[PDB]
Design a protein that fits this description.
The chain has 265 residues and is of the alpha+beta class. It has a single domain, classed as DD-peptidase/beta-lactamase superfamily (Beta-lactamase, 3-Layer(aba) Sandwich), CATH 3.40.710. The protein is built from eight helices and ten strands. A six-stranded mixed β-sheet has the order 1-3-2-10-9-8, with helices on both faces. Helix 2 packs antiparallel against helix 3 and helix 2 packs antiparallel against helix 7. GO terms for molecular function: beta-lactamase activity. One of its GO terms (biological process) is response to antibiotic. It comes from Thermosynechococcus vestitus (strain NIES-2133 / IAM M-273 / BP-1). This is Tll2115 protein.
C-alpha cells in the first residue's frame, strides 16, 4: 500500500537547474521513494529514444509469457540469420541457426544487452506490435518498439516515467508471479554496465537496473534498495551530442544527489 507522490520541490529545482545549465544536453528523470512518497520529476514524462532500456519492458513481457505457459524457460530458440544483430552481445559470434534455451537468451538480452538475443525474444513473443500492445496495457504510454535492435538510429521510444513506473509495479509484486519477479530482479542485478545510476549510490545499496546507450542518448532505470531500509525507483535519460561523456556524468551526479537526499531524510 503505497504513499502518495510528494514532490521534493527544492531538490527538483536544484536538479532542474543543474540539467539545464549544460549546453546541448536534454535530460528527463523520474524518481520515487516507496516509503516517503518523495518524488522528483524533471522532464520525466518526455519521450526519448529508448536505446537498450527498452530491453527491460521486453524482459517483463518474456516472464509474463512464461507465467502464462506460452513460453518455457528451457525451450530452444533459434538464432535465425534475420535476427542476428551487431553491437553488444555474444550470440552474434555463434553459428547462425544454432539454438539456445529461452532463459539464457532473455538473460543475455539484459545482462550484456545482447541485441541478437533481444530480437530473438521480440520475435518469440509475437513481434513489436504484440509487445507494444502489452506495454500500453501496463500503462506505458510512450514505450514503443519501432525497429529491431540495436536500433542505433533511436526509433524505439520510452520515457523516464514509463520505465520507473514499470519497475515500481514489478517491485510491488504486480504483473509477474513471485518466481518470475524474483528471477527478473536477479538478472537485472547481474548487468555488466554499472557506470550510470549505480555510480551515484552509497556503500551497501543494491540496484536492479538496465542501461541504454546509443551515442545520441544515454540512460538507465531501476530500483534501488538503500542500507537504511528505504527503496526507490529511478529513471533518467539524456539526449547528447554523439558519445558526449557529459551525459553519462550528469546521470551519476543526479543519482548521487537523490541518494544523498534520501539518506538525509
Amino acid at each position: 500500500t503505497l504513499p502518495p507522490e510528494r514532490p521534493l520541490t527544492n531538490l527538483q529545482q536544484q536538479i532542474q537547474q543543474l540539467v539545464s545549465r549544460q549546453p546541448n544536453l536534454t535530460a528527463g528523470l523520474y524518481f520515487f521513494n516507496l516509503d516517503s512518497g518523495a518524488s522528483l520529476n524533471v522532464g520525466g514524462d518526455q519521450v526519448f529514444p529508448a536505446a537498450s532500456t527498452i530491453k527491460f519492458p521486453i524482459l517483463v513481457a518474456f516472464f509474463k509469457a512464461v507465467d502464462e505457459g506460452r513460453v518455457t524457460l528451457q525451450e530452444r530458440l533459434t538464432m535465425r540469420p534475420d535476427l542476428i544483430a551487431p553491437e553488444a552481445g555474444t550470440l552474434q559470434y555463434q553459428k547462425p541457426n544454432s539454438q539456445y534455451a529461452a532463459l539464457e537468451v532473455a538473460e543475455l538480452m539484459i545482462t550484456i544487452s545482447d541485441n541478437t538475443a533481444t530480437n530473438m525474444i521480440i520475435d518469440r513473443l509475437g513481434g513489436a506490435a504484440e509487445l507494444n500492445q502489452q506495454f500500453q496495457e501496463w500503462g506505458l504510454e510512450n514505450t514503443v518498439i519501432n525497429n529491431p535492435l540495436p536500433d542505433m538510429k533511436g526509433t524505439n521510444t520510452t520515457s523516464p516515467r514509463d520505465l520507473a513506473t514499470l519497475m515500481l509495479k514489478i517491485g510491488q509484486g504486480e504483473i509477474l508471479s513471485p518466481r518470475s519477479r524474483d528471477r527478473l530482479l536477479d538478472i537485472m542485478r547481474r548487468t555488466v554496465t554499472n557506470t550510470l545510476l549505480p555510480a551515484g549510490l552509497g556503500k551497501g545499496a543494491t540496484i536492479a537496473h538496465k542501461t541504454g546507450d546509443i551515442g545520441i542518448v544515454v540512460g538507465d532505470a531501476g530500483m534501488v534498495d538503500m542500507p537504511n531500509g528505504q527503496r526507490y525507483v529511478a529513471a533518467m535519460m539524456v539526449k547528447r551530442p554523439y558519445n558526449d561523456p557529459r551525459g553519462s556524468e550528469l546521470i551519476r551526479q543526479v543519482s548521487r544527489m537523490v541518494y544523498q537526499a534520501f539518506e538525509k531524510l
